[PDB]
Design an enzyme around this catalytic site. Structure first.
Site, PDB file in Angstrom:
ATOM      1  N   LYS A  32       0.828  -1.201   0.000  1.00  0.00           N
ATOM      2  CA  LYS A  32       0.000   0.000   0.000  1.00  0.00           C
ATOM      3  C   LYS A  32       0.863   1.252   0.000  1.00  0.00           C
ATOM      4  CE  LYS A  32      -2.892  -2.671   3.116  1.00  0.00           C
ATOM      5  NZ  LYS A  32      -3.770  -3.372   2.131  1.00  0.00           N
ATOM      6  N   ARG A  70     -14.554  17.808  22.376  1.00  0.00           N
ATOM      7  CA  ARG A  70     -13.485  17.831  23.366  1.00  0.00           C
ATOM      8  C   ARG A  70     -13.460  19.201  24.028  1.00  0.00           C
ATOM      9  NH1 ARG A  70     -10.165  13.605  22.846  1.00  0.00           N
ATOM     10  NH2 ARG A  70      -8.336  14.658  23.746  1.00  0.00           N
ATOM     11  N   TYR A  74      -5.700  14.585  30.064  1.00  0.00           N
ATOM     12  CA  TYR A  74      -5.364  15.779  30.830  1.00  0.00           C
ATOM     13  C   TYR A  74      -3.962  15.668  31.409  1.00  0.00           C
ATOM     14  CZ  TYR A  74      -5.597  19.371  34.442  1.00  0.00           C
ATOM     15  OH  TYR A  74      -5.362  20.485  35.216  1.00  0.00           O
ATOM     16  N   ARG A  75      -3.688  14.552  32.086  1.00  0.00           N
ATOM     17  CA  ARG A  75      -2.371  14.361  32.674  1.00  0.00           C
ATOM     18  C   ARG A  75      -1.299  14.188  31.609  1.00  0.00           C
ATOM     19  NH1 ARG A  75       0.382   9.620  35.731  1.00  0.00           N
ATOM     20  NH2 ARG A  75       1.914  10.756  37.011  1.00  0.00           N
ATOM     21  N   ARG A  76      -1.646  13.712  30.410  1.00  0.00           N
ATOM     22  CA  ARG A  76      -0.663  13.639  29.335  1.00  0.00           C
ATOM     23  C   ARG A  76      -0.385  15.001  28.711  1.00  0.00           C
ATOM     24  NH1 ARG A  76      -3.913   9.641  27.713  1.00  0.00           N
ATOM     25  NH2 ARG A  76      -4.119  10.483  25.582  1.00  0.00           N
ATOM     26  N   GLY A  92     -11.389  14.726  25.904  1.00  0.00           N
ATOM     27  CA  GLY A  92     -12.711  14.200  25.589  1.00  0.00           C
ATOM     28  C   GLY A  92     -13.585  14.047  26.816  1.00  0.00           C
ATOM     29  N   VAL A 145     -13.076  13.917  31.584  1.00  0.00           N
ATOM     30  CA  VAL A 145     -12.170  14.101  32.714  1.00  0.00           C
ATOM     31  C   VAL A 145     -12.127  12.795  33.492  1.00  0.00           C
ATOM     32  CG1 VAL A 145     -11.534  15.530  34.670  1.00  0.00           C
ATOM     33  CG2 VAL A 145     -12.807  16.522  32.786  1.00  0.00           C
ATOM     34  N   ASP A 196     -15.441  10.516  34.313  1.00  0.00           N
ATOM     35  CA  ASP A 196     -15.142   9.169  34.797  1.00  0.00           C
ATOM     36  C   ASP A 196     -14.407   9.311  36.130  1.00  0.00           C
ATOM     37  OD1 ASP A 196     -16.182   8.215  32.382  1.00  0.00           O
ATOM     38  OD2 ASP A 196     -14.245   7.615  31.542  1.00  0.00           O
ATOM     39  N   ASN A 224      -0.765   1.627  27.179  1.00  0.00           N
ATOM     40  CA  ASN A 224      -1.074   0.582  28.156  1.00  0.00           C
ATOM     41  C   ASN A 224      -0.996  -0.810  27.532  1.00  0.00           C
ATOM     42  OD1 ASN A 224      -1.536   2.531  30.115  1.00  0.00           O
ATOM     43  ND2 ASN A 224      -3.782   2.273  30.133  1.00  0.00           N
TER      44      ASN A 224
HETATM   45  O1  LIG Z   1      -9.182   0.930  25.868  1.00  0.00           O
HETATM   46  C1  LIG Z   1      -8.746   1.610  26.774  1.00  0.00           C
HETATM   47  C2  LIG Z   1      -9.246   2.912  27.045  1.00  0.00           C
HETATM   48  C3  LIG Z   1      -8.683   3.599  28.072  1.00  0.00           C
HETATM   49  N1  LIG Z   1      -7.687   3.035  28.829  1.00  0.00           N
HETATM   50  C4  LIG Z   1      -7.076   3.817  29.915  1.00  0.00           C
HETATM   51  C5  LIG Z   1      -5.984   4.725  29.286  1.00  0.00           C
HETATM   52  C6  LIG Z   1      -6.742   6.039  29.017  1.00  0.00           C
HETATM   53  O2  LIG Z   1      -5.886   7.205  28.905  1.00  0.00           O
HETATM   54  C7  LIG Z   1      -7.598   6.088  30.303  1.00  0.00           C
HETATM   55  C8  LIG Z   1      -8.793   7.020  30.141  1.00  0.00           C
HETATM   56  O3  LIG Z   1      -9.682   6.558  29.109  1.00  0.00           O
HETATM   57  P1  LIG Z   1     -10.263   7.671  28.103  1.00  0.00           P
HETATM   58  O4  LIG Z   1     -11.282   6.998  27.264  1.00  0.00           O
HETATM   59  O5  LIG Z   1     -10.793   8.844  28.876  1.00  0.00           O
HETATM   60  N2  LIG Z   1      -9.006   8.147  27.094  1.00  0.00           N
HETATM   61  P2  LIG Z   1      -8.011   9.498  27.167  1.00  0.00           P
HETATM   62  O6  LIG Z   1      -8.281  10.237  28.426  1.00  0.00           O
HETATM   63  O7  LIG Z   1      -6.599   9.069  27.020  1.00  0.00           O
HETATM   64  O8  LIG Z   1      -8.415  10.507  25.986  1.00  0.00           O
HETATM   65  P3  LIG Z   1      -9.756  11.416  25.870  1.00  0.00           P
HETATM   66  O9  LIG Z   1     -10.498  11.198  27.168  1.00  0.00           O
HETATM   67  O10 LIG Z   1      -9.323  12.840  25.725  1.00  0.00           O
HETATM   68  O11 LIG Z   1     -10.435  10.812  24.667  1.00  0.00           O
HETATM   69  O12 LIG Z   1      -8.031   4.720  30.522  1.00  0.00           O
HETATM   70  C9  LIG Z   1      -7.229   1.798  28.550  1.00  0.00           C
HETATM   71  O13 LIG Z   1      -6.322   1.302  29.201  1.00  0.00           O
HETATM   72  N3  LIG Z   1      -7.763   1.094  27.535  1.00  0.00           N
HETATM   73 MG   LIG Z   2     -12.522   8.370  30.386  1.00  0.00          MG
HETATM   74 MG   LIG Z   3     -10.089  10.786  29.097  1.00  0.00          MG
END
Ligand SMILES: O=c1ccn([C@H]2C[C@H](O)[C@@H](COP(=O)(O)NP(=O)(O)OP(=O)(O)O)O2)c(=O)[nH]1
Ligand SMILES: [Mg+2]
Ligand SMILES: [Mg+2]
Ligand SMILES: [Cl-]
Ligand SMILES: [Cl-]
Ligand SMILES: [Cl-]
Ligand SMILES: [Cl-]
Ligand code: NA
Ligand code: NA
Length: 331
Positions: A77, A151, A183-185, A191, A193, A255, A278
DNA sequence: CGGCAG
DNA sequence: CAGTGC
DNA sequence: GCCG
DNA sequence: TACTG
């Protein structure tokens, strides 16, 4: 360690020399994901991270195959796009995919539900609203369909975290609350908290959801619950919807997890992510005869031994990985 | 040939 | 359990 | 899809 | 990996 994304800084992706390739591959990957071909999509996701982090523009079939996560098929590809500028398979994606994407962006509807709705002849969210059978969760997802796709500025995530923290610390002043996930990253937008709660005394974390949730509901802060098992007292997590007070505020996903202090490092590691970080780290642990969960790092079973992990750095060290600050785990 | 996180 | 989401 |  | 049903 060249082959493990958890062994590398995710800032490698900030200089993507292969964007014209990865933007096309991302379209295919999403098509496979919403159709339910999860393992093919996973291979695509890993190839895209490999291409985003490669140090130069890929220019040949041989160079491509040498990259971990890129095999013969992906290489073919790549050289089709290099030569012709286009990827023919993009013109031959099932016509159901836009609708399957529309449907599976309903919280609580995945690929199986979306495919069923599609086979029943539904094509729009109006069709779902008026004709689909929805679960309690899916009906909330649909009501907040646009909200859950938006977001928020990380500054708003701070206000949400501070709302939860102040409510919790009001009834136990020693509770520790930390916003994790994106947030912590260090992302500019989030998306949702992801709030982790624990108590350093090892035991006062127990039974706080009932008091915390009641406090947040008395304020009008929580506006809908997605997952909240409040009847048996073993509640580890809350997933729901909140809205800060006053004008110009949107419903935001929230969450919360409560964890015993002895599991703090592994829980913090899990909840900070990213998800693919992870999965890489956990896959790496397995190859070493270990197992990494949100609860503990342990050795393989027979019951394994639980390894000492007082801080996140100890998990990295026990897996032979160089430490990465959260912002470098954004795979 | 089967896993692909837990 | 399958399905879903973290 | 890729990997061992 | 923890929820729902
Ligand atoms: O499939 C997953 C999803 C999340 N997680 C862990 C890592 C992730 O950063 C954390 C929070 O899940 P979120 O769905 O909130 N993802 P994230 O915060 O990284 O991005 P955003 O919330 O901005 O989409 O839970 C996993 O281990 N496996
Ligand atoms: Mg979450
Ligand atoms: Mg998140
Ligand atoms: Cl107190
Ligand atoms: Cl990996
Ligand atoms: Cl051993
Ligand atoms: Cl730590
Ligand atoms: Na390769
Ligand atoms: Na969904």
């Amino acid at each position: 360690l060249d082959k493990w994304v958890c062994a590398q800084p995710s800032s490698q992706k900030a200089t993507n020399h292969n964007l014209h390739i990865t933007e096309k591959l991302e379209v295919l990957a999403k098509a496979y994901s919403v159709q339910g071909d999860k393992w093919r999509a996973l291979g695509y996701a890993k190839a895209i991270n490999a291409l985003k982090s490669f140090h130069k523009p890929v220019t040949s079939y041989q160079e491509a195959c040498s990259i971990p996560g890129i095999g013969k098929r992906m290489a073919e590809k790549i050289i089709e796009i290099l030569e012709s500028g286009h990827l023919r398979k993009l013109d031959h994606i099932s016509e159901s995919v836009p609708v399957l994407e529309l449907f599976s962006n309903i919280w609580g509807a995945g690929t199986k539900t979306a495919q069923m709705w599609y086979q029943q002849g539904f094509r729009s969210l109006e069709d779902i609203r008026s004709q689909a059978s929805l679960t309690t969760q899916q009906a909330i997802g649909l009501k907040h369909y646009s909200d859950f796709l938006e977001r928020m500025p990380r500054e708003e995530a701070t206000e949400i975290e501070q709302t939860v923290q102040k409510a919790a610390q009001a009834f136990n002043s020693g509770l520790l609350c930390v916003a994790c996930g994106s947030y912590r990253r260090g992302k500019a937008t989030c998306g949702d908290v992801d709030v982790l709660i624990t108590h350093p005394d090892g035991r006062s974390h127990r039974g706080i959801f009932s008091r915390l949730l009641d406090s947040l509901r008395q304020e009008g802060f929580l506006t809908d619950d997605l997952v909240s098992q409040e009847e048996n007292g073993q509640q580890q997590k809350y997933l729901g919807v909140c809205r800060l007070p006053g004008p110009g505020r949107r419903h935001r996903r929230l969450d919360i997890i409560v964890v015993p202090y002895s599991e703090f490092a592994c829980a913090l590691l899990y909840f900070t992510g990213s998800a693919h970080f992870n999965r890489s780290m956990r896959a790496l642990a397995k190859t070493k005869g270990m197992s990494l969960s949100e609860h503990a790092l342990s050795t393989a079973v027979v019951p394994g031994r639980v390894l000492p992990t007082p801080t996140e750095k100890d998990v990295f060290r026990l897996l032979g990985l160089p430490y990465r600050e959260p912002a470098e785990r954004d795979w």
